[PDB]
Amino acid sequence: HKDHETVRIAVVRARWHAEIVDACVSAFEAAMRDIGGDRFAVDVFDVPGAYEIPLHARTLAETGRYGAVLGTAFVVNGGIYRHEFVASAVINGMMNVQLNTGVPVLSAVLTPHNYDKSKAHTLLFLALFAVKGMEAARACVEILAAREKI
Amino acid sequence: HKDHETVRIAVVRARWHAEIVDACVSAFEAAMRDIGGDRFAVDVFDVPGAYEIPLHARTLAETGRYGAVLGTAFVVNGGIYRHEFVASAVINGMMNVQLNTGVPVLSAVLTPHNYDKSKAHTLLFLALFAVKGMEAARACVEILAAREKI
Amino acid sequence: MEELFKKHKIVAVLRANSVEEAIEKAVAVFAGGVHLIEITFTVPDADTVIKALSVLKEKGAIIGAGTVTSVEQCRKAVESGAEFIVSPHLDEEISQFCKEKGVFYMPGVMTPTELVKAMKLGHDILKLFPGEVVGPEFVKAMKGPFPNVKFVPTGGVDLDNVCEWFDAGVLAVGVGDALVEGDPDEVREKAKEFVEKIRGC
Amino acid sequence: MEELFKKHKIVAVLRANSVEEAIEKAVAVFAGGVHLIEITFTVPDADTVIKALSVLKEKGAIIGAGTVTSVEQCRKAVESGAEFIVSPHLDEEISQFCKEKGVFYMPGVMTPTELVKAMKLGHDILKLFPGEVVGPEFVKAMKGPFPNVKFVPTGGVDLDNVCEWFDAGVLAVGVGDALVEGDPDEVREKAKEFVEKIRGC
Amino acid sequence: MEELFKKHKIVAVLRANSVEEAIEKAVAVFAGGVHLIEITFTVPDADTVIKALSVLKEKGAIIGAGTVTSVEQCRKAVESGAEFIVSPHLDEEISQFCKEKGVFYMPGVMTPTELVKAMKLGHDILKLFPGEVVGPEFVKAMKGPFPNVKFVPTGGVDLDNVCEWFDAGVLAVGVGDALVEGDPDEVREKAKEFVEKIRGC
């Protein structure tokens, strides 16, 4: 038939610092509508944190119900322990998932240099996440379409 | 039949700094009862240290007897050698296990910025571990249930 | 709680914007010598804090919760293991709830009328609040008509006047920011200063 | 009244032995920058004053009445156009009357128990009285257990400490003799001084 | 916008070479107390900045865009959620576009003729620009023939003379580099200084 099918996109988002993580997701969804032109539709799923994204995203990617998956989280230094170990496992995890499933996984998992949850920091990240959301939507449409050209 | 089966959860815990690691495990078990409502049950296994968790947890995950596995340990800088090499291998190990078995593995392996086993430090970590236990129980129920929705 | 107040003579009052913050202060305070710790119920996720700090009970800590204004809040404080409940004001519903649950309750008062209503309900230990308004003078004046009433003032208490509060006849003093604010290491030193100052008077 | 208290941060409290005196002060106060004016109900023929000063409403004045101890007094304050009623104490009959009439009511309190009774009846803005006894310390202490309660103290307020009252968290301050006593020209200058001092803090 | 200009008395004018830079300044400025923020439309990818900063609207920020010279630019500023549009000069096409869209428009003027053309088109709030040429003297002089015209000067405004601009009768002042240039922490301190200086005059 003629390909007029909606491309399904999944977003998997961490519940920590949801006010910030969701800023990205909301911006992403709006941008997908602005760019996609209803050629794309997005479903959103929650995950406890960044750590579980690679399995949740994969379970979903291997289902064949999505053209692409966006993982997102705000991973910060809590002042107690080193967060780098998880952040490393997660970025490598998502990289491995797209290489194992054939479904591109975009990363919107941020590891800031500094975040003390100050008034200014909270506000800064809400805005920066909204920007990343918009960038991810553009990346989504362009990469999905680009792989279709091979 | 009707699904009224108990979800089996395994916990694999390091014997180093057991007073702290067990604080997490005890809190986890209590929280699983509080949240699970007897829909879940948890078995606990000991492991010498964090290093062996990925194989023990996997042996168990590949047995099919558990819906999910929680690994836990307190990995610290002994002042003698760098502990980061193991911590890296372990977090990557657990990430690889859940991606190889299809059984989510939760991480409650902590790598603190500082721990000199002072009075205050010991007490701090006993309480922080109890908190992580409670968080893990919530994550467990929610992620297990979330993957069931795909 | 009756033995404990007499034994320690001080209650730390914690306030925090997070679970981790509440824990660090509780530990600095406890590690520094203060065993009776009141967690304001208004700490975001106070319920988590109250339950997580139950680990310190095996080290001799007594964990309870303050700023309780309702029975629903009490129920959660009890659910998490609070040893005691402290309210900003005498409240009959809180008191009856607490009696049924077996959790120690300390109502707040400022005047003889309020004091008496609490006595008539069986509460001989009162939170005096704000201590900033009534002072050690109130505590002493009350001993005339109410020789059997014990107070634990909150506010108006620092290491500079803690001995005045004791000369006046308080049972114990609650201590706020003077004891619990600052870097956890500063907090631990402050706890030692309060314990030692009370020890000496 | 909620917007108005936030907007102006000051209420003049008038006392007079005559209608003409009350008018001259109201005008000096208003002309000098204070828009929220409370007329004590005890001014001889206060009803005349309240109604006569309704002319200032078209200039942006808000006219209400204070020292209300009963519903009969409230009825007359309402009859004359009072925007708001302020009582020396929380009074359930005044409160219910005011709710039925749609006139803003501000009850008086001094302790957490009284504060809470008012909260339970829907009054989150309280008259704090005497402010001379409780001070800015009370206002600040109350924010812990009652973070959503606003105060408008009367007494204990002058231009010397008005900023302390604001640092403590008051909504607005009522001002008595410090603002309204003296020659109407002196009164007008005092009103400017209070407005400017609050403007700066 | 009419209420907002009266309420805040200051508009930050942002300039940046990037999206991240514009955000950091907007946040430092906002966090420091300035709620009305104008984003020059010439910021590379200003459209991204305008839309990304829409998150601050729920915190009380008002986000608009400046240096608009055409209707195509206006359309994008509107598309991204600009609350208002400010042009370097009165422009009839911008004005008509803005009226149709319902976005507040503030035209720029320097002389009575330009002022009047704007009045005849329904614009009683004008951008005065450069304020560096005309000064507070122009603003005051204009009140004679144009008592109903409000100005928001840009340029010639610093914390050293902001009160002169207000004595002259401006509605609000726009502030450029004096407010927004420097390290985001320096910017936040400058915002506090401007707000406090205006607060006092």
Write the topology of this structure:
This is part of a larger assembly, with two copies of chain A (150 residues) and three copies of chain C (201 residues).
Chain A: E1 7-14, H1 18-36, E2 40-47, H2 53-61, E3 68-74, H3 84-101, E4 105-110, H4 119-147
Parallel strand pairs in A: 1-2, 1-3, 3-4
Helix pairs in contact in A: 1-4, 2-3
Chain C: H1 2-8, E1 10-14, H2 19-31, E2 36-40, H3 46-52, E3 62-66, H4 71-79, E4 84-86, H5 92-101, E5 104-106, E6 108-109, H6 112-120, E7 125-128, H7 131-142, E8 150-153, H8 162-167, E9 173-175, H9 177-180, H10 184-199
Parallel strand pairs in C: 1-2, 1-9, 2-3, 4-5, 6-7, 7-8
Helix pairs in contact in C: 2-3, 2-10, 4-5
Structure commentary:
The structure is cut from a larger assembly and holds 2 copies of chain A (150 residues) and 3 copies of chain C (201 residues). Chain A is α/β, with parallel strands linked by helices. Chain A has one domain. Chain A has 4 helices and 4 strands, in the order E-H-E-H-E-H-E-H. In chain A, strands 2-1-3-4 form a 4-stranded parallel β-sheet, with helices on both faces. In chain A, 49% of the residues are buried. Chain C is of the alpha/beta class and 201 residues long. Chain C contains 10 helices and 9 strands. Chain C is globular and about 45 Å long. Chains in contact: A-B, A-E, B-C, C-D.
Count of DSSP H/I helices of chain A: 4
Pairing-aware structural class of the strands and helices of chain C? alpha/beta
As laid out across the biggest beta sheet of chain A, the strand order is 2-1-3-4
Number of strands of chain C: 9
Beta-strand content of chain C: 15-25%
Distance between the termini of chain A: 20 Å
Work out the radius of gyration of chain A. Answer: 15 Å
First-last Cα distance of chain C: 21 Å
Helix content of chain A: 40-55%
Counting helices, strands and paired strands, the structural category of chain A is: alpha/beta
Describe the sheet with the most strands of chain A: 4 strands, parallel
User: What number of structural domains do the residues of chain A give?
Assistant: 1
Spatial extent as radius of gyration of chain C = 16 Å
Quaternary organization: part of a larger assembly
PDB class: immunogen
Keywords: self-assembling, HIV, immunogen, sosip
Entry title: BG505 sosip-I53-50NP
Chains A, B: I53-50B.4PT1
